[model samples]
Target: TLPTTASSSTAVASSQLDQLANFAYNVTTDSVAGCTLQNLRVRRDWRAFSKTQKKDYINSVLCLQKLPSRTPAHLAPGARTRYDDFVATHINQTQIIHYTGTFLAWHRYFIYEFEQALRDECSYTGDYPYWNWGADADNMEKSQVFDGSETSMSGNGEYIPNQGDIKLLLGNYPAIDLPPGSGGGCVTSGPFKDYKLNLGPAALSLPGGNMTAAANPLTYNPRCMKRSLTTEILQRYNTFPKIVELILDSDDIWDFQMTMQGVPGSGSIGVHGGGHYSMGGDPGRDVYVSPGDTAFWLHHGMIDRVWWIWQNLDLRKRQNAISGTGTFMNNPASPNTTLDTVIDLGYANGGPIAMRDLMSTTAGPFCYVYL
Candidate 1:
């Protein structure tokens, strides 16, 4: 069973929030473009899944890896599989997408397209799950999402003592403290324990002489999926209350979206960056190819959830509204962007999609709604 179209005021009660969260995973059908399909994607908290559900989700991901890459001939060395194609896309388009007007809508379509690929290509039938940082912000390492158990998303990397505090310094965003995580080495448990991260670090040059920026981000550079899980950053920035504040305080669409992303002048890291930092790792820390980490989908799933909630809060004003004067990191300072701007998915599939069509969950090519 599923709930009706989700609508709420800025002052949403905790019970209502829980209701939406709980209902997110209970759907069984999807009817987009007048075609009805079973097992519609219903994003939910990772902990809500049963053991079998976790295994199925992980298996689907593994299946994607086995599939071949569709990147063009010249890009072959960059992309090794259909899975790596996404990594390549994200890396090539990182600058145009992030810290600009297209970040939210682009990613919304990106995640949705990725989910469709899982169902169509891999025959996955389970709901797409997300990690709600709020639920386990205080104890991320102990949380079911990263508990290191057989059903978890593969526990933290092996604990490396005294790694010092992790520092985050992006564009105009001031330096922020990211305390040491439970793990700073290779992941050592769960389904992805033996898995490898095959792409990225396009921009995040690491110690021991890793490429600062790969000549081709799509090029395969296989390595372990590193996770340095942290509770301090999660609890401090990505909690329920902070999300509510972002919704209630934002007066315009740009402010709301940018604030969520913690852009240069946005002051705070907001929930978007918080979730990424919560699971610090190579691809996790790497802004360009963050999708290289399997957790990228889950993290972005929650981001989409928050956007949906905000849109429902004031459908009339926020649904079609977009902010920001320019597309590429606000440089050159162009006029405000509109929903008509064509959003390219890089190579995730489907040509350019209209931003207006993606504004509503129940309109255009989208028909599903948040619980």
Candidate 2:
């Protein structure tokens, strides 16, 4: 093994940056949305899965993606994202990933990863994408860039449909395998089989370059599994960090919102008593998903960007603090490494990271890339 020298560190960083730069450029012209980069990737199955599944998958992947690089289960622990190291090092991974409650907490961590990735790639950093709710609060469907439901501007609440700007923000095509389709209402195979790294042959066969085979291990998929491809995942890909586009069901989204922002306790989530949402039952049949899903990372990435933008508006700093600090959780982080009876993995920096710390961009060790 080589010593951890400054020169070696620079070299490694340069390589990762190259990959990052290439990835950002690739997504714009190589993703699944007719070569665009701002829409969901697997719309067909995603719509059928419901927000519950959608959010569940996202949370699962985000957590799983952060596993140690040398874990026994995975050959390359950091094969996908070494940024996990940065987060784990700086914050309390144990509590954040296990306790703390709200899905947005971890969701924000995911955003930090993308921000760092862009910074590492080109040494360029800026505010994350914004939802601009102010731009169209009445029309969430149009304001969001994902749902694009004409109903976003109409109705009261449930009657209000989501917008489709998520696709536009990420730049991908609309959902495939629409309703009336069989086998879970998702596409089992197709040209867009998965978010291609370099926009491979728009068919299931996928040219020679993409064969990660995440579905079978024989072929690993890079996207975070959104309903379809989007700029969030595609823009910064370079054959690595190949996350599957995310797609959460409605229940999942509702569960997260209630548990994180609604629940009383440390905003913690899980099977514990008072843990299961009381008023937050069933996520309703409407379908929703929270940012915890690994796929939510990208969505949250843009959200984080929004947060960063918000932070800029204020002169105060917003780094190293917990997300949604103060209002959601009562106490700040500590070295205890346990919350709600769960042990924390410890941020890469081995910090107990408080909610306030993460809320600010100037807080500590933060950067972003926007073109």
Candidate 3:
């Protein structure tokens, strides 16, 4: 009876919170008249790309690296190049950007902005490509994205052995036994083999360690981009079964986003954390600076793909559906949070994006679709 009483009380509170959220914001779906649906940039899986397309993409990435930094001189001293500017911006503004109701919408615009930079800054015409981790879960090393060829995203870092389970960093989830892959050393193949990673951490130790991510996230902590790919993590959390389960099991936006972000004691890392852990390295594990590794973009493309799929499944309900207390985890309700909320990119070009305009990939500044 005691357990039942507690459960019922929690449910009543949650129901009230939902009502408050709905009442506070007048949610609007994307307007069809304002959207340009045709000739959208078609985003595809990396494996589907031609050798030429892959090379062009890699070239554009390098071009961004070579350009001068555009970040303001005050915030981040280590943000010395165009590439570092993005990483630095991410590092500086991670707190407000993540674990909130605005996470998906915010990232949607941010990723598109990066794609725009590739086109405007480097003259890149190739459409953005994503890596389907489930498709390559069995043997990621041989996948087109990490095959170590010149056209690849640059194979995993050199092989280093004996990596034990990764202790979960952010949440209260139990330790994860992250089986290491064939590369733990510096990347030795592909277009970025010799390229230098100028910003962000080379390693992120646990909470008590001196080099923990929170130590000085914005400072320049230069080192080569490293990777220790893991099959165990991908197979366990990023499988087709898990992806389908997440989409189908979540009945509303609240359930869907919470599950995607993952809850503690839920017995899973959730799709978001799963993708990050699958990459395995400093930038990969270090949530704030993961953008330093180009793979971060592709991995996030997949996240956006999943969200897009979910949105289209029940466009009427899911497209406009949003849930959160306005604050991040464990905070009290802030029902007044609205679509008018502004997203600050810190340094990434394009300011203050509005929540409403960012809702649809086919509308406003975004005109794209995943294939």
Candidate 4:
């Protein structure tokens, strides 16, 4: 096998920058609502951030963890801190958001609002960072994002010897099965090692072909954060080539987001679910409570990044794109999302934002681009 030399890696990076530049140019024509190129921020890969930057981000998360919760105990008894409030909000809104037309924009704003909270409430000054799933397909543990260093997002869970592959079958969606990774026990390193989750293990599908959910999902139930960190799913489904195909192959907005999230008979989890299972664990595999995992934001940040690139390639068509109903694959049959549709973040965000504003990276409350 050919080794990845400096020249080859640099060539690949050059192409990515070309895309970034093109995206910037595309944003210039979007009628920036109080945002300009000079003041725009650049979000980056977790590995790209320096040790100091990572600590700032990590400490900001801890700051939020220590802050007061916005949701009352009646809504989410487990919400002991501001961080849990977001988890509760996501749990409250999960069904309507996923597999819908607002999926991309809703999540885009969700991460942005979280980033804003980090800055406003916690004094964080760093730009939001994304995990480039492709980079870790081969060796996630050694990557800066999970290297067990204080500078990292934190290490994998403590190794558990007897655990089996995680398996799940979301109602009518294809069944998912994945082999275990290096860690399955409690996370035991870096800033998040001591982290404890206080929300739902709701919709946790595990080994032995069993799926479980909390009867009172939002009630107080604290537990350790577990992760198996599988490379198999990510390697097979979410690699660089697959992401490239996702961008270049699909022209219609509906097809782009649909295939991005995976569908029936596709067999593969697609890039979206692939990233979720890559962090395999109680909340990792849990659809409703996955955001309880701190890495969720970074994963969504990358999702938003991919959407940005897709939108940048063709401004007229993708800039204000919308399709599908207001519910997940129209499970309960909700109305279709128009540009005026509102994304409610429950106790997490201060107010509702229109879907149209969330569409453009340079418009609305967003003014950042990926590196």
RMSD to the true structure for each prediction, in A, is: 4.8, 20.0, 8.6, 4.0
lDDT of 4 by residue, 290-319 (tens): 888888998999898888877777688788
Q: How far out, in Å, is residue 58 in model 3?
A: 0.9
Which model is ahead, 2 or 3, in terms of lDDT? 3
- Distance from true position, residue 52, model 4, in Å? 0.7
Cα lDDT tens digits for candidate 2, 318-355: 22222222212324543432222222223322234444
TM-score of each: 0.86, 0.32, 0.85, 0.92
lDDT measured at residue 124 in model 4 versus the true structure, 0 to 100 = 96
TM-score ranking of the models = 4, 1, 3, 2
- Candidate lDDT scores, in order, read 0.72, 0.27, 0.70, 0.81
Residue pairs that clash (backbone atoms under 3 angstroms), model 1: 69-81, 78-218, 78-219
Better candidate by lDDT, 1 or 2: 1
lDDT score at residue 311, model 4, on the 0-100 scale: 79
Model 3 lDDT per residue over 114-172, tens place = 88889999999988999877677677777788777888878788776565446664445
Top candidate when judged by TM-score against the true structure:
4
